[model samples]
Target: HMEVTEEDIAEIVSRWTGIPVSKLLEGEREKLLRLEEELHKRVVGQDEAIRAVADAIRRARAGLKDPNRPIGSFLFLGPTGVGKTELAKTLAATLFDTEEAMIQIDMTEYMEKHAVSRLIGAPPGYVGYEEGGQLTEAVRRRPYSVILFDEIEKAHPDVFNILLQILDDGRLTDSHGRTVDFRNTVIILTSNLGSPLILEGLQKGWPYERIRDEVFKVLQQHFRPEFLNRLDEIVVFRPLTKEQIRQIVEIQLSYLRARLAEKRISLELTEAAKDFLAERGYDPVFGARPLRRVIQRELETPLAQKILAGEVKEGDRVQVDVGPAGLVFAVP
Candidate 1:
């Protein structure tokens, strides 16, 4: 007869409890201690937000945080594509050791007043049988994870009431009256509130406290006092500079390089081309998404054409160059 092992049970419990099976070793120490390092790899700049989450998480892991609250709750205030969502994704990966544990609730989906019913569940009760709220069910399925509320302002006002309950009580009940525990999750609510001003201030070289203070004034103007008072931090993200854009281009190319490796091909970008990709593709207002489209269009598409053109083979090494024009591909 085959026998069960601790490994088997650990994996089973991992699925049921949402705590990663790898936590039985130094992985926990590495995750908590070098937290910022892991985060910094994918998220380009803005040390302030990373440090804020890092410290709060350490305190939560240390058992010093509030007993009734989620592990940590933060409002990330910033412009688009500058690692607002990426940081949360990275946090879920870093903390739970799996990106599968992150729950994303896009407030755009809950813009209508009736839409809130789906988040916590349909009205009256769980008359639908086994039908649970999207938010409640996802957390119920994985209690230990990071929950991201994207563009919270886009959600119905009813959603804010539920958020208040989650932040204040560490739990939420669905239409079925089944309460979901959120104490083990990290609640990350992202908003564009005051982001235009944050971007403006950063552009004009304003002081940190001055920008933070101004942003906070805007936050108070929008949110209730009770709601604003409960967050662990109101993290203000600075828009990515061209310097950060260069680093991001490197990261993106590294990913592209791996894809080429799968085809038994080698990929290289010249120094000039790398800078050209960074400078030409990245927009200060838009951040990293456009840079990504540039890579896909400029690098991948040309490489794909070459692969099919019979000039490139499985074992070929290709070099990409950029001049006064755009991307140039060479087997040399």
Candidate 2:
């Protein structure tokens, strides 16, 4: 019943971070902030969007109904490559201090009302349910992990309703009428739900706000008030601005450098590399998505080859600078 307040944010961040309030913003950090930092390290820009989502976590941690079973659920609406899914992964790792605590579900797998039975198991008349469903069992066994529902809108509307009880009661009754406690989980629902608006903009090259507004409207229309209300917070992740995208480039460059440094390989960024990546394939409506493809193509593919060829050892560091034309690499 309380609005997110400053004191609440500070307290939650402090407790989770384990840093005293006096040193809150410095080297001291919390599980949530560390997750944001790690995600940012690989993710590049979109600090504002990341921070917004992190703030929601802060609020969720601050306000838990049952201390024994703490749960904070969120719905993230955004286009692809905004790191919605990554955030969930990082949060789980940060909260439980391990990667094993995360459980992810692809909503499309449950697009049919009947298919959702796979989550809770067959409703008594179905076959193979006795073996148990992935969704209910995973959470029941490891309630402290983060649970993610990817592309939530792609699933049938009935699936969205499944969250109603989870959000309200903090417990879900499985198909066999067995109650599964969700009070200790953090639930994340991610969707590329604004694809149309983003696509329309690139076709017309319209202003970014036009797409943001249009997409927000679409989401508002699609979700019923009750369903929406069940969310502890709904974050509308906006498209990355040019400045933000540039920041992303810088961030990625830093990440590559760190990997190289770990191998005692010295690398430095040249201006040509910086300018190349900054000017290439800038898409505001797409919001930092294009960068992922660029990284996958330019770095991952090459690194895999170099490693396989024995040209670069596992510990070797590699650095590349981007420009309009291409890149410059220096490895020491």
Candidate 3:
């Protein structure tokens, strides 16, 4: 009587979301049918990673997997600022219809032996296990979601001990002795084990698969065979370069202008401004995340002021040039 029935929880989730069980299942079915089509729309060039994940998608939804284990469990490896987290986030939004359906457990935070308790909750002691657990309690309440383990290579052996239970059984016992289910969830553990090899291979013009093959060997050195044995697949994401950012910026700007043109004004930026926005906006860790931030503050704020002041006519050819402060807009 302590916990809600699985059916009741599902019913409540459906009621609050305005989605019926049949419709939800149908949506997921239809969604995964075009898995490649969907992910390719938003993700840049991680074709190797994309193909592996889509295969995993079909494997899970194809109803041909183990009964008690999770539908799929994956390991994402490569350098920073790649499509690893982006892919995981997009999968959550695609399957669950919301990115919040994913939970990120940054393994960097769980590096110590005692940090294991933080995930499953403090031991049943005078402290009184307040939140049930950070990881267990969440999955117990909502079983259908993505569980992301970031920087898994950095986690303690104790965390891997708990992961063994989740991987083998898709079931875990919390510090409170309550059971948490992961049968419907996807496990995505991201690591940066062979980043140097990945970059070096790219420089040498090695095939993407060859680079990925070398990366998996690197994983073998850090994680035990027991832990690595249970994963459904391993995907290697390529690093993002400034050269790619230049093209990405062009597409972002094209979309911005296309949307702006619908509002009657046409926009143009000088080569210096385009390069300035691209190179200056490039973020090595997040990879293009700052472009929108830079553009919004510099371009949008200044452009909005010009619009509100009625400084230009409806068919204005607004020009954006470079300056020490970034993009300078003019009514020329």
Candidate 4:
């Protein structure tokens, strides 16, 4: 009979709790070395953003980070659709082995003073007191999650006061007085801070480091120094490059290809077809978001129509190419 090994234990625990098996059984140093490479699989560009996050995580795992705080706390500043949120999801999957391990709280919904109660839950005898705060309860259940506060600048000042507690102490008590640990969590706050300056800088072909400095100056005016100082890193994601946008096309298509594979149908796109979508999808301000809609409208809709019309079926290879009108689908 075969005896159970440490690898077995790690695998079992990974499956049960979504902690990465490599993190449990493998040398964490090796994992840190490849962190940037792994995150790049999902997030296309923004090298500075990726490196800052990877370095912080490495420091935390290397026992260099403060033990009283979360594993890593970051402020992601950039324009919309620049892979700020995508990096958070990638970190959740890379570090915790599951995207579901990410707890995303949209800060827009918490713009009022009373909204602060929603994060820690209502006081005793108040409505929803027994239910617990949304943030605390989620972290209590999945302690090893990547908590993302999207559009954090929109949140009320009271929310930051609660955040300050978590950042400083690495824990928070619910309304019921139950202390929730956050040391195992990675805290990420994303904002569109200095977006206008960034866009203008990009238009004028300003150097990245220079633009970063300019943005940070604006950030200092907006956020309190105490709150910003607690963060391990401030990652500013630059706009996606054309080449990066091309790669994004490939990344987004992987899902569609996988779905088609399940039906025994092969999907392929020509260079011209990719260029067609890339050109139309490319937006200086909007970033990669427009690419998704372009793919859906130009590729998915047409192929879906073909499939529904009985022109395409299982075991068939579908080729997408650019034509005089637009994207043309052919079976070969």
Tell me the number of clashing residue pairs for each predicted model: 0, 14, 0, 1
Using all chains and alpha carbons, the TM-scores for the candidates as numbered come to: 0.85, 0.70, 0.76, 0.87
C-alpha positional error of residue 234 in candidate 1 after TM-score superposition, expressed in Å: 1.0
**What lDDT tens digits, residue by residue, belong to model 1 across residues 250-316?**
8888977787789889977788888888876766567677888888887888878889998888888
Which prediction has more favorable lDDT, 3 or 4? 4
Please report the candidate that would top lDDT against the real structure. Answer: 4
Candidate 4 lDDT over 1-332, as tens digits, reads 26986667788888887666756753653545688888888888888888888788779878997998998888987688879888889888877777988999999999998887899899998888888899999998888899999887788889977888989999998889999999889889998879988789989999999898998797887777777888887877787778888898898889899999998999778888998988888776787779888989999998999999989898899888988888998986
For model 4, how big is the CA root-mean-square deviation? 3.6
123-177 per-residue lDDT for model 3 (tens digits): 8782638776789988876687789999887888898778778999899888878
Q: Which 10 residues in a row give candidate 4 its minimum summed lDDT? A: 23-32
In candidate 3, which residue pairs clash? none
TM-score of 1: 0.85
Q: Is candidate 1 or candidate 2 better by TM-score?
A: 1
lDDT value for candidate 4? 0.85
Q: Rate the local accuracy (lDDT) of all candidates.
A: 0.82, 0.67, 0.77, 0.85
Q: Which stretches of candidate 2 lie over 4 Å from their true place?
A: 1-70, 205-217, 246-263, 278-293, 296-325, 328-332
Alpha-carbon error at 4 in model 2, in Å? 38
Residue lDDT tens for model 2, 159-249: 7677666777788788878888887677888877778667978699989888878877878877778777666677766666666666767
